[PDB]
Amino acid sequence: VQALVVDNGSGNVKAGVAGDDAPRSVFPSIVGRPKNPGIMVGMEEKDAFVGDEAQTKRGILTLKYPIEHGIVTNWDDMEKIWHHTFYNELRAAPEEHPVLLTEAPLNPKGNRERMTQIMFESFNVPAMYVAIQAVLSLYSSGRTTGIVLDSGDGVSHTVPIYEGYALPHAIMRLDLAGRDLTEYLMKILHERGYGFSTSAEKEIVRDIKEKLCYIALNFDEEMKTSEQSSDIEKSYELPDGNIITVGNERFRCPEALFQPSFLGKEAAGIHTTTFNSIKKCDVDIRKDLYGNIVLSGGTTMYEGIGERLTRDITTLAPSTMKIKVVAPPERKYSVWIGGSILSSLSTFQQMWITKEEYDESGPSIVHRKC
């Protein structure tokens, strides 16, 4: 009767037991291995730190994110992360509860198969189910129709849905996300004379990004508006104590989402992946889709994304239709909350993958029940 909800992002792990309004444990997904040798006798090594503990001391550690673009690169690392979750933070047993793992649309079969296989074989779990992040956000928004476009560090989905039915041919993933905007925010931040070559320093960047970055209404405008610089430059204060001052970098760093040309990729921006994901949907549901666009996931937390996205689509799609982007407060957790509502539904209880069914049917069954 208690469903255990773990949504594995890239660069966050949000885990809380079902029925709560906000997740218990929110900690970045990081596996630190101390680079230099330990000296002081009596210290507890704990060879590989994990999660928040390992982001409290980042000066000693070489951090490796195990998830890059929503696809596990290194399993040992992830497995260790989950272990940290269930034991050190959720404080729930593996064998007692069913758990809900979350996954990205169009994600290689390898992640499903090997993900569950690692859940049943190494951990022991009674039942399991892995749902597309996008759709889960839609439960949270509590409405039955709309595009759900989320962007987490790894991946950015656009999954349209019409009145409860999902469109498998419309789904569209772009790879511009939080970690490409940080790994970009360095290439730009060099311009000012600052420079960050190291992992720990990359996370310092990520903080800069979260605090000081906004998205311009019209970028061509603001690039001119910054010639005369008054309140645009905000002073960020490092863990060091040195005082940085970031210029244009504030609004040209997050803009990479709308123009990927900057990052160098040939993909289309967010506005043309939303709009395009619609244009693949039949001409009859476009009304509802244009109406219900729901932002989700962290990367869209930037101040003023709603306005820019709306105006931009409106420019793209015919003027007759009203475009409304619903940007709910506390959307950073939308995927998780959707995990709660979903896992708490009385009819949903039929769909869990069962310890038995896995045992007899092999790990490949995951593909059939998703």
Ligand X SMILES: Nc1ncnc2c1ncn2[C@@H]1O[C@H](COP(=O)(O)OP(=O)(O)O)[C@@H](O)[C@H]1O
Q: From the annotation, which residues make up the binding site?
A: 10-12, 14, 153-155, 209-210, 298
Least distance between ligand 9UE and beta carbon 343 (Å) = 26
Measured distance between the N- and C-terminal CA atoms of the chain, rounded to whole angstroms: 21
Least distance between ligand X and beta carbon 179 (Å) = 7
Alpha-carbon torsion angle 150, 151, 156, 161, nearest 10: 0
> In terms of CB distance, is 24 or 114 closer to a second copy?
114
In the annotated binding site for ATP, the residues are 10-12, 14, 153-155, 209-210, 298
- Tell which positions 152-211 bind ligand X, by CB under 6 A: 152-153, 178, 206, 209-210
Strand order in the sheet with 156-159: 172-174, 156-159, 148-151, 294-296
| 330-362 per-residue burial string, b: 16 or more CB within 10 A, e: under 16 | ebbbbbbbbbbbbbbeeeeeeebbeeeebeeee
> In terms of CB distance, is 35 or 224 closer to a second copy?
35
- Among 61-69, 71-79, 256-264, 329-337, the segment contacting Mg ion (CB under 5 A): 329-337
Are the C-beta atoms of 140 and 334 separated by less than 8 Å?
Answer: yes
- Tell which positions 257-316 bind ligand X, by CB under 6 A: 297-299, 301-302
- Among 8-16, 36-44, 204-212, 313-321, the segment contacting Mg ion (CB under 5 A): 8-16
Q: Is 327 in the site for ligand X (CB under 6 A)?
A: no
Contact residues for ligand 9UE, defined by CB under 6 A? 69, 71, 106, 108, 110, 175, 190, 193-196, 201, 238, 240, 242, 244, 283
Q: Determine the Cα–Cα distance for residues 357 and 369; give it in Å rounded to an integer.
A: 11
Angle subtended by helix axes 109-120 and 75-83, to nearest 10: 50
Question: For residue 230, what are the CA distances in angstroms to 191, 227, 248, 280, 343?
Answer: 20, 9, 12, 44, 50
x/- string (CB under 8 A) for a second copy, residues 2-41? Answer: --------------------------------xxxxxxxx
Least distance between ligand 9UE and beta carbon 326 (Å) = 25
Max CA-CA distance within the chain? Answer: 72
- Among 3, 4, 9, 274, indicate the residue that binds ligand X (CB under 6 A): 9
Q: Determine the Cα–Cα distance for residues 205 and 145; give it in Å rounded to an integer.
A: 37
Number of residues that bind ligand X (CB under 6 A): 16
DSSP character at residue 366: G
Least distance between ligand X and beta carbon 81 (Å) = 12
- Which three-class secondary structure string do you get for 61-75? EEEECCEECCEECCH
| 191-221 per-residue burial string, b: 16 or more CB within 10 A, e: under 16 | eeebebeebbbbbbbbebbeebbbbbeeeee
Q: Is 368 in the site for a second copy (CB under 8 A)?
A: no
**Closest alpha carbon to 214 in 253, 272, 256, 260:** 253
The CB-nearest residue to Mg ion is 152
Q: Determine the Cα–Cα distance for residues 171 and 344; give it in Å rounded to an integer.
A: 26
244 binds, among Mg ion, ligand 9UE, a second copy, none (CB under 5 to 8 A by kind): ligand 9UE
327 binds, among a second copy, ligand X, Mg ion, none (CB under 5 to 8 A by kind): none
- Among 332, 339, 352, 353, indicate the residue that binds ligand X (CB under 6 A): 332
- Tell which positions 257-316 bind a second copy, by CB under 8 A: 261, 263-267, 280-287, 290
Are the C-beta atoms of 24 and 15 separated by less than 8 Å?
Answer: yes
- Tell which positions 85-114 bind Mg ion, by CB under 5 A: none
Least distance between ligand 9UE and beta carbon 39 (Å) = 21
Q: Determine the Cα–Cα distance for residues 235 and 228; give it in Å rounded to an integer.
A: 17
x/- string (CB under 8 A) for a second copy, residues 205-234? Answer: ------------------------------
- Tell which positions 119-148 bind a second copy, by CB under 8 A: 135, 138-139, 144
- Among 1, 47, 193, 360, indicate the residue that binds a second copy (CB under 8 A): 193
Place of tokens 């560090």: 153
**Which residues contact Mg ion by CB under 5 A?**
9, 152, 297, 335
